[PDB]
Symmetry: none
Subunit: 232 residues, 4 copies
């Protein structure tokens, strides 16, 4: 029962996209405030591809930060299989110990994507701020917002070190929401895993012009160390 940790910024201001839809109203953000209830961690925005859970989102002079964990046994073993059948997972940008499941995560699903729904149609303004509801964070081939590139690890301590622009105050407390959430029960065999839906999602990621060069800028924007397990 060993689990991975997914961390990174789902949205950064110093990495603002030209699209205004992506813009998140900091008002709705601080409205959803802390840990009401965790958020579903899915693979490529697939509701049938839940692999873990987001146990907190936080703000920084850098941007919104998301901390989650992958607890899907059948998915954790998939990254295992996938690893020795993927030259891209195996080879490393920079020499580092052989880390199966995580090196696969970095080749398969590099970025983070925060999706929100909107009661849309009835429109709102939480006495200052337009309504939206955080429903899930997904691991993807490339998030829409820049600097969304993640980091995978066995311990937040090490996983959070990569983000030097992360106010120690957040990191200090975030290390606790992890132990706190560790009370979660057990939910194996929840949806095998849409291998077919996942392959399709992997196919879409074959037609991304300048993706590796964009994942480069993302690790730099997140100011993550150039000696990371990332592939770009």
């Amino acid at each position: 029962a060993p689990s991975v940790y997914v961390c990174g910024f789902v949205e950064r201001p110093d990495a603002p996209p030209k699209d205004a839809c992506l813009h998140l109203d900091p008002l709705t953000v601080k409205s959803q405030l802390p840990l009401k209830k965790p958020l579903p961690l899915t693979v490529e925005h697939l509701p049938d591809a839940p692999v873990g859970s987001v146990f907190g989102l936080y703000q920084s002079s850098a941007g919104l930060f998301s901390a989650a964990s992958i607890t899907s046994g059948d998915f954790l073993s998939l990254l295992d299989s996938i690893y020795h059948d993927c030259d891209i997972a195996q080879s490393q940008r920079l020499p580092l110990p052989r880390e199966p499941k995580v090196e696969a995560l970095h080749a398969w699903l590099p970025s983070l994507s925060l999706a929100s729904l909107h009661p849309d149609i009835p429109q709102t303004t939480a006495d200052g701020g337009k309504l939206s509801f955080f429903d899930h964070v997904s691991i993807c081939a490339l998030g829409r917002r820049r600097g969304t590139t993640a980091v995978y690890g066995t311990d937040l301590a090490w996983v959070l070190k990569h983000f030097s622009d992360l106010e120690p105050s957040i990191a200090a407390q975030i290390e606790n929401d992890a132990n706190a959430a560790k009370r979660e029960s057990g939910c194996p065999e929840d949806h095998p895993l849409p291998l077919t839906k996942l392959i399709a999602k992997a196919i879409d990621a074959g037609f991304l012009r300048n993706r590796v060069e964009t994942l480069r800028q993302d690790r730099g924007v997140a100011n993550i160390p150039a000696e990371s397990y990332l592939k770009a």
Copy 2:
């Protein structure tokens, strides 16, 4: 359930290699000659991913041409599944009549790859040529050779038209080897990994573009690039 045809040039002299091992020797070419028995059609070179069979290879003033057919029911239904879940497959570059299985093939495994078995040490420069054994052609993300951009379809007539520079003489006869010939689940995990690798290639889409231009296939085709 019917079968799909894969056609295209595995090697085009008009679109050369930058290195030496990716060169073909007319020696081995006229050596392998027409058909011996069918040739295994695999996916990303996976011996356990056989989806059809190559029923002939031919020469042209333009290059080497490969004609194959996909008959694996389990794979034919996979391009089915895959299609309503693949935005790149669903969306067309130009307006053309929707084509599930085919649209998927072009986004998933667009190119062709000709693999040959070679000796450890120079074994038989049969002073008629260098030695190599053609063992299979695979459908992949992007061939290492150029003009490799393949064409998928239901009927060869239409499938073979996409090739201008191809001589009618071969196409006319090739349409017969098909009727003549008419006489491993699929390690999805291994296939995904192969698809992951494709996610880390530089200029793939832009390279697939130059390929359909070099292989002389119209813009009005089902090439996702």
Copy 3:
């Protein structure tokens, strides 16, 4: 007319390569496994110079061992001719009972060479190993691998003794595959050319010496070096 046995190590871990392609992968090793059908025994790798057949290959704490047999009458009489015209064959390094055909083999084609067919592009690192197909073993002037110095003889019992470090378990069983198995002119011009090439090698004799020392064969053997 009888047949001659060729034995020796085609590869010895205790006597390593200076390069990468001359490495063997235990993967392909346990893949090819015992026998499938006999293996063609050729001369200097000439497909048109088949003189016998390899009836088994085995592993040892010391390396890979090859057991073959020569049965070509036209070649058996050639070592006959060749002997009374080859001063190097006639003259022995140490006093031993005259042996025409054999003395010739040791001066003409002393070493063993294991050739394998490899894919054009990485084809099947069967995640159990790298892919290679053993197509034949050839007798040559001086193998590219070390400890390759082979041993020729009339009876395996004696032929297999020359190998100290070889386990009795394999030799005992190998003597049976021989009885079990017991159930192209010869392009002299191409052979001469091959012999000419051997005339232009640096340290051949001195290299063949280190080979019999590394393959653990006695000084009291029929090795011309």
Copy 4:
């Protein structure tokens, strides 16, 4: 009916071997004087391997020089076959036009060897000089006397240029003994060619320690140009 030319020194004083047998008494030499009758040109001292004829031997401040020609049609075509089946013949030390038959000669039979018989037993002294009879010159893998390395060509003009230590007086006249001998009739199918005997002779040439390094010194000793068709 195109023929090759074999030239070089069969014996040089500046390249004297330690063996005294090899020593040729200059007295018997000038005794055999010029062109009595040509000498048989054989392959590896094989009486059954006649491939041409020696049409003159000459002396120099350098040493005894031998000029011969290969007229064996069935042997001339053998060097042809042999050529494209011999990587050593094909490859060149230094880039030069593709010359089949001759490039094969240089890889197969580099040196020259002058053999003489001796009435031996009755002993003689041609009023100054011990009796010996020149019976043939053979082309071999390596002659016993140093600097015996030959040169093959279609015209003596070019073939003789290689030996700058060759008194023009000799060369000038030697170019004539060639036209003179060109009266010789025709003797095809004289002895197929002991392919078996030739292979054996080729096998012996596999156990020559430091042969390529000795063929080097020979081209230097003969002061032949380093841009020659020779292989060493």
